Design a protein around this ligand. Structure first.
Ligand SMILES: *[C@@H](CC(=O)OCC)[C@H](C[C@@H]1CCNC1=O)NC(=O)[C@H](CC#C)n1cccc(NC(=O)c2cc(C)on2)c1=O
Ligand code: NA
Ligand code: NA
Ligand code: NA
Ligand code: NA
Ligand code: NA
Ligand code: NA
Ligand code: NA
Ligand code: NA
Ligand code: NA
Ligand code: NA
Length: 187
């Protein structure tokens, strides 16, 4: 069976509704006041979290050493609540996965779970014309409004949903080394 119980506990405590100029996205909180959102959401200086306008204190659009989009943007928010630290649920390496759950938390869909089946390390994807790397694939007709959706197996948060074409769906990997504590001018 899919890990429905695990997906639920991640959604209860570590998701919020994020709204940018592009619209609403499920947003996974990872630790403290640090969360993720698809890069194509176009995060700016402020963002709405659960319909509350919130200062975006930092935003890092991840790219790899080939200078290629990874479709993950990490944000640091000015909010009073800390997110439960779930970094230990993150995969250390790239991997293929069995029988995963995709979970959405938006205004339209406050609590919804989609078993997407097997998830394979896809690698390169031309995402809406942007070369992208480190992509996970599932053969499932995901749909508009599900970007940012959290992809889990039991015990692991493996990525967030970033696109699809009516036949397959795609998530950007989440790796533990993206959120370890570490001087670097990054803007
Ligand atoms: C999520 C965006 C969203 O939720 O926005 C909230 C405001 C959707 C999810 C897609 C739509 C249909 N099925 C899905 O899983 N993302 C998109 O529509 C993305 C966003 C980006 C970038 N998008 C835009 C343009 C093209 C595509 N798809 C492809 O390029 C593609 C290539 C292959 C193979 O499969 N898809 C896309 O996902
Ligand atoms: Na909107
Ligand atoms: Na950051
Ligand atoms: Na680790
Ligand atoms: Na509504
Ligand atoms: Na192919
Ligand atoms: Na396109
Ligand atoms: Na929609
Ligand atoms: Na296909
Ligand atoms: Na750490
Ligand atoms: Na850590």
């Amino acid at each position: 069976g899919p890990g429905f119980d695990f997906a639920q506990a991640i959604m209860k405590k570590n998701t919020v509704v994020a709204r940018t100029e592009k619209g609403e996205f499920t947003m996974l909180g990872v630790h403290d006041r640090v969360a993720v959102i698809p890069t194509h959401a176009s995060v700016g200086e402020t963002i709405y979290i659960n319909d509350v306008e919130t200062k975006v204190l930092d935003a890092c659009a991840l790219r790899d050493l080939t200078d290629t989009n990874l479709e993950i943007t990490i944000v640091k928010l000015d909010r009073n609540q800390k997110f439960r630290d779930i970094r230990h649920f993150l995969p250390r390496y790239e991997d293929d996965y069995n029988d995963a759950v995709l979970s959405v938390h938006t205004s339209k869909f406050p609590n919804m779970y989609i078993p997407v089946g097997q998830v394979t390390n896809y690698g390169f994807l031309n995402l809406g014309g942007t070369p992208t790397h480190r992509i996970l694939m599932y053969n499932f007709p995901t749909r508009a409004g599900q970007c940012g959706g959290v992809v889990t197996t039991t015990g692991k948060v493996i990525g967030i949903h970033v696109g699809g074409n009516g036949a397959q769906g795609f998530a950007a990997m989440l790796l533990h080394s993206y959120f370890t504590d570490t001087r670097h001018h990054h803007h």
